[PDB]
Structures are given as structure tokens and as C-alpha cells.
Design a protein around this ligand. Sequence first.
Ligand code: NDS
Ligand code: NDS
Ligand code: NDS
Lengths: 280, 271, 274
Amino acid sequence: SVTANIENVKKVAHHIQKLTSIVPEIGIICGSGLGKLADGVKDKITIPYTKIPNFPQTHSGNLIFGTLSGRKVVVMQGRFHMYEGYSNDTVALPIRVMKLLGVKILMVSNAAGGLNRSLKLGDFVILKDHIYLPGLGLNNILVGPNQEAFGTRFPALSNAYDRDLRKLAVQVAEENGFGNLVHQGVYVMNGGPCYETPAECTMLLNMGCDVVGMSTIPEVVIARHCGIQVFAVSLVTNISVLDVESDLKPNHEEVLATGAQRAELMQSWFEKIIEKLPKD
Amino acid sequence: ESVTANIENVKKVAHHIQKLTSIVPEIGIICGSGLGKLADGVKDKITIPYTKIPNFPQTSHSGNLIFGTLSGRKVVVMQGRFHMYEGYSNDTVALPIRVMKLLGVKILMVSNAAGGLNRSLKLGDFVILKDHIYLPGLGLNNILVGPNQEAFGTRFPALSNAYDRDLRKLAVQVAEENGFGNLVHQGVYVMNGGPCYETPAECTMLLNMGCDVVGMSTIPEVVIARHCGIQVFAVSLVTNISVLDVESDGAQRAELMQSWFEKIIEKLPKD
Amino acid sequence: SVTANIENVKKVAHHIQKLTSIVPEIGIICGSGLGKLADGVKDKITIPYTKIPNFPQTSSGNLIFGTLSGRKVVVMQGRFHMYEGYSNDTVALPIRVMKLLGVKILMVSNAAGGLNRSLKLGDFVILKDHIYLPGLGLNNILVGPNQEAFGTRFPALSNAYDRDLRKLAVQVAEENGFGNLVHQGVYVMNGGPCYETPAECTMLLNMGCDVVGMSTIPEVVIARHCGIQVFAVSLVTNISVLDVESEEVLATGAQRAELMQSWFEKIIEKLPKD
Ligand SMILES: CC[N+](C)(C)CCCS(=O)(=O)[O-]
Ligand SMILES: CC[N+](C)(C)CCCS(=O)(=O)[O-]
Ligand SMILES: CC[N+](C)(C)CCCS(=O)(=O)[O-]
């Protein structure tokens, strides 16, 4: 990976600006439930990661630029997960590129396990806060020399999950008849890639966590560090088992199935949030 | 560090071992510190020093693999382990377990020495692990971080019944019928990366997290074993009782644990 | 960049020993509140880190030798924080150099967020214990081959924060009229460099932590490993927010610097000579 410093981020951004004239104001990272969001983007240019020098590589992932709900967007189709062995610089560079391209708001989804006992499979949990277990343990994405062109050395994570975007998301769900599926909660990052043990889930629930997943927080930290507002949502793809005696367990195909089942609704929700954002 | 624990490299190591012994092990046993006696009962033994195995990790006496039978069943015993607090890599720790898989191991029995958090524990008690909290794993130091080796298992392994409940039940029964059931507990093991012992504040936090014992090993091996379908039984010997507040200031047990493991193996189901 | 082994640590200590004849008994690592401690030292011999070969670089840091309240000291001005990406050996080496130079007591300050709800901005929290979140998660400074020259493989952290040094520190504060600022508590390390979220702060408070910061514990572990007594104090530079819907740190340090400096000087004055 190339260092996600201003020099390298500029080179990548400048290369992208030759390929498209679209100045995105919203960046979207597609997780669970957002698998067909790129189809909804109109007047789009699709740039495979392979066509961007010094951009991380993960068919190839794509950067999609276009209009969604009357706004200019860049959609990241293809993520770089820490459990896959990717570096901090790999995860940070795409977010910092979004910043240089013009992104003001980052919207992201992911799949998570439901710790909170009131959660149902397929529920949406808007992140209102997080617990960054890797970050507390010296694997924070920002470890290393601070890049002052982007942000400060010790970023505050106050209002990390923009309260006004959260309020809007809830309002849109309620107005469109699926407010009953929507919660707000604390997301804890398990580095992964193992699912959480019953003892681990019990610990995490008692720490005050509502959902547990293996991603997202590193991007959120980079976004907040460089001043991008964040809206993040976990799709509850499994209900955490807290009891060792239980034979119930997380199953990959069912986790993927839940994402796919909820995709139309999740994308609709994101689209309807975007159309309500103030603009001009 | 060391060679990637992929199918090609693990196969190469396994094939080398299969030229040094004709014993196909069904059960793998990992001896913890002060617990080398678990190998002493091995009948018709064949000893392979780690130095004889190219690409197998090396200790820094030499470590050995011991093949033979215990209570009639074919076993491989690991004498010398690779601890994460020593600076060994994920691949180093993973490779021996994946080698055991290819050699034919279906059940892994692991022992370690641990600190007692649960206040009902006494020095010298055995705590069968029923579950774990992998603090390094939750914090982005999980042994499986990196490309998944699909030949061994799936990207996101579930850890349900990680400590096989039928093996736990059998182990408790064997202890009770041999008159040391009073020494045996079941509990949750939490891994401290180490190598520092836990401070009183750490011990209190860990106890309140729902942990019964704390140690510096084992979980990484358990994760790799479960990832590739090996059933796991694991037991901690309580060698220290954790102090919970700042204001406040073995040999026979190894032999007993040896006997216990032997008597468990005698009763293991056999297809 | 160099292993903190006996061979490398000795080379560094020997280089320092030809630049100064002062044999330090007390080492002091300046965090928040101790920025001006170097100015108060008498018979100063300032050695910049650039002038010590094999010594880690941060810039330009200084090792100041001299006397403080009649006792020989070495003051580290310029620390090596793990959130900056320094290696374990980088952080360990200066402490082990201190050991070889003659240091018996290490006094350290830092800036920390107040979790305990009774704390006020500018309070002093003497560390009596810690929770080393990085260490529990496989990022302990001692991971790797144990350097037997300095200590044992599995160091115990019983009495890590020497109880007699804590007693002395509280007594000095009480008799100089600022005992009302002094608390004793548990420090938890957040690797950093992000400040802790409300959910993180709530979790940490419920684990039994009184203050949270991003330093100190690694140095304390190396010091205890090699048998140096430790006194550590956090300056409360921020009050943790525990619920969502929610410069000041640098101002608190600069404001309380004089008092903390005075406190450290007066502690060194009352230390046992035998
Ligand atoms: C439940 C989702 N699993 C299978 C763990 C995939 C993790 C990818 S993530 O964290 O971006 O949703
Ligand atoms: C005295 C050794 N301690 C710290 C208990 C570590 C135990 C090593 S183990 O896990 O193989 O038993
Ligand atoms: C408040 C200052 N923080 C963020 C903890 C940075 C470290 C300062 S230090 O060295 O005094 O701990």
C-alpha cells in the first residue's frame, strides 16, 4: 500500500478527476443491503479500481460517480477489510480521496450481529456511537505520523455519527412505514474474522454494545479526522447467541440472504434520505 | 515470520513427518508449561524433534513431536509450543495445528497453566474451558487475520460449541469416577497477550467480564483447530490465584492431568 | 530501530557517561504539567537525542542531567508515544538506559481524560494501578524475546505504583495546601490517537477505570521489568463525556504546570536517602 499522505491522495484524486467531471458531495460505501445501489445511480461513470494507479485493489471493485436522488455521489463497490490483512493506509486512502474529490457526507452500511435482545433479524441499527476495540488496543487506523493536511493529531469523536443525519434517517423510515425496523445503537468492532463466542457476546452486551461487526469504524475515524459527516447503518444479519448450550449459530449463506432480502428497502431508505438533504 | 500456513506448505510438512513415522494420529495433545508429563504414558513411542522437520517452527532442550498410543488410541503429542508473547507469527502458531489436521487428528486436547479469577477456585484446580474471550482477536490480532486458507476452512468461522460439550461432559465424568471430581470446574478462559501478569485492576475487569481464568495462550490454537474441523477439549491448571485489589499483597497435578487425559482417551468414541 | 538488548543499551549509557559525570538516582519523564521542569534543574548538562547514537529520535528531545532538591536526576524531555508508530524497542531503550545509568525511581506525568465523575479539570490522579488494553490484546511492549539482562519473562505488576512513593506524594500535597486536588486511581491506556467516544468512556468507567490516556503504561512495564520503582500522576486535562449529543487540554497543562512541577520537586526533597 502507498502511504495515505496528501501527496499520494492528491495523485489519485487528480487521476480520477481526469476520468470524470462529476464532483461528488456524498460518498457511499456499499455493505450489506446496498449491493444494487450502483444500479440506481444515473448518468454514471464506472471506474474499476484497476484503472486507478496507486488505488488499493480488491471482478474488480469499482468507484461509481453519478447522480442519486438529485445529488452527485461516488459509490464504493468493493471494500478493504482489516480481517483480510489490509493495511491502515489501504483503508484510509479511499476516504481521503473522497475528501479531495468534494465529499461532504459519507453513508455506509454493514452486516452485524444483534447483541441488544430487543433486536430482530433483518432490523436496521443506525450507529449513534461506537466502541473501537482495535483502536483502544493500539491498532487504531491513525497510528503513525499524523497527516496534518487532513486533520489533527487527536481527533475528537464527539458527534461522530451526525445527529441530524440520524434524525433524518429515522424520520424517513417512519414516514415510509418501516420505522418499526429501525433502531439506533452502539456498534462494537470485533477485528474478526471469527464470529463472537457466547462469552464474548455477553461481555460486549454488558459493555453497552447493541451490535457487533468486523468493519466500518476505521473508515469512520478517517472520515471524521478529515471533516466528513458520517451516517452508518448495521443490518442485523445474525442474532448473537449468548448461551454456550445453544446449537444456534451464525451461518454465512443466511447472513448473505438477509442482506439480499433487505437490499431493496435499504437502498430505498438511503435514496430517500439523500433526497431530503438540504442542497444548493 | 516463517512460512505461510497454506495447504501447499502444510502438506509439505505433513508429508515429511509421514516419512519419519507410520503412526496416523487420531488425537493431538498440546502440553502446557510444566505439563510435559502428558506424553509419559505414550506406548510404542516414536520421537521426532522439531529440528528433523523442515519448515516446522523451531523452539528457541529442543521441542519434540511424540507419536504412539494412549489407552490404545493413536496420538501425537506436542512437547514445545509457540507462544505469541515470544514474538511468533500467526503462521507459526497455525502451522502445527493444520499439520495435525493433515496427519489425521480429529480431536485436539490442550492444556495450559492459568490464573484463577473466579473466587471459588483454588491453586491446583482444573478448569475445563467451556468458552473463551479472545481479547487479541477482538482487537485485530486474531490468528486468522489475512487471506483465508480455503482448503482448511471458511472465511468467518463460527465458534459455537468450540469446546465440544460431549468431550467436556466425558471429562467431568472421568474425573468423578476416578475420585478427583472435586478438583474440576468448567469456565471461561480469557487470553491476555502477555507476557505481564495481570494487574489487580485488570483481574477485576476480567472477572466482571465473565472470565473464570486468565492465561496467555491456547485460544489461537483453538481457533485454528475449529476453523479446520478439529474437535477441541482444553483444560487450565490453576497455578496462581489473581489478586483483585492493590491494597492486598504442580508436579503431582501434571501427573494427575496425564492420568485424566489417558482415561478420557480410553472412553472417547471410536468409529 | 535497535533492539533494547544489553549490548545496545550499554553502548548508549557509555556514550552518555562521557558527556556527563552526573550519576542519576531519579529519572523523570515529562508529560503534561512538567514542560518547565527542565528549567528548574541546577548544574544542567543538556544532551540532545541527536547527540546520542542509537538513541531514538523525536523532534529535538533532550536528556537533562543535574540536581533537583539536592538529588541527582535525569529528565527526559521528549517522549516516544506508541500512537506515533514507534516500536517497542524504541520506547523500552531509554528506560533501560536509565537503569544502567543508576536510576532507582522513575517519576512520570501524563495528560488524561477524567472518567471518575468526582474528578475536576486540573485535578491530579496518582496512578495506583492500570489496565493495559494494548497489552491484554497482544501489543504489550514486552512481546518478543525476553531480554534476560533486564528482567524476567513474566513480570508481576504487584505494587507497580510503589505504595510508599504514593504515600509520600499525598503527604507532600497535604502539607503544601493542595491535597484537595489529589486523588488516587486506575489509569487505562487507549492506544489512541482518537479521543474516546462516549460509549468507550462509559465502558471504561464500568471496568473500574478512573482516568484514560494514551501513554505511560509501556514505560511503567519496562521500568518494573528492570526493577525501577515507579511514581506516576495524570493531570486531568479533559472531562469525559459519557452520552452522545455532545487547546483546552494544552491550556490545562500550561496552567497546572507550575504546581505539578513544585509538587515533584518537593517529593524529591522528602525521598529517603538510605
Ligand atoms: C456478518 C457479516 N460478515 C459475514 C461477518 C461479513 C463482514 C463484512 S462487514 O463487516 O463489512 O459487514
Ligand atoms: C508461568 C507461565 N505462564 C505465565 C503461566 C504462562 C503459561 C504458558 S502455557 O499457556 O503454555 O501454560
Ligand atoms: C491529552 C494528551 N494525550 C492525548 C493523552 C496525548 C499524550 C500526552 S502525554 O504524553 O502527556 O500522555
